[PDB]
Design a protein around this ligand. Structure first.
Ligand SMILES: [Zn+2]
Ligand SMILES: [Zn+2]
Length: 99
DNA sequence: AATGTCCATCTGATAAGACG
DNA sequence: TTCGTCTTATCAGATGGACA
């Protein structure tokens, strides 16, 4: 919901980010700020091996080398136990950060 | 050849918010 | 209600491939 990059006005991106003052830049635009200390010169031209879902905000790799949904890779790394197919939840839930 | 830049994509930290 | 707990978003940093 509703975020448009503060430099290039992008609307989608592999992964969002923020700068020192906590403004939402797209990936490339932010990975540019951390590194160069400069607004990025615009001019800018699968399923979980565990729960078999095709929807996640972040893909990872199981101990094997295969893509696992978010939820899963976190679960395993934390319980050293494949995440039950019971914890499976519906749709998507979102959250509001802010430093 | 050999290094540097740009950036998706992964692994790691922080912590939101559902729920006991 | 009120407050810990636990799952897992959503941030930050690491790693690597593509191109100059
Ligand atoms: Zn941008
Ligand atoms: Zn999964």
């Amino acid at each position: 919901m509703g975020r448009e990059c503060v430099n290039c006005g992008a609307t989608s991106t592999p992964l969002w980010r923020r700068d020192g003052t906590g403004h939402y830049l797209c990936n490339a635009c932010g990975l540019y700020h951390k590194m160069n200390g400069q607004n990025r010169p615009l001019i800018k031209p699968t399923s979980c091996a565990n729960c078999q879902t095709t929807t996640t905000t972040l893909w990872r790799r199981n101990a094997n080398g295969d893509p696992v949904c978010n939820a899963c890779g976190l679960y395993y790394k934390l319980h050293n136990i494949n995440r039950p197919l019971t914890m499976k939840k519906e749709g998507i839930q979102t959250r509001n950060r802010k430093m």
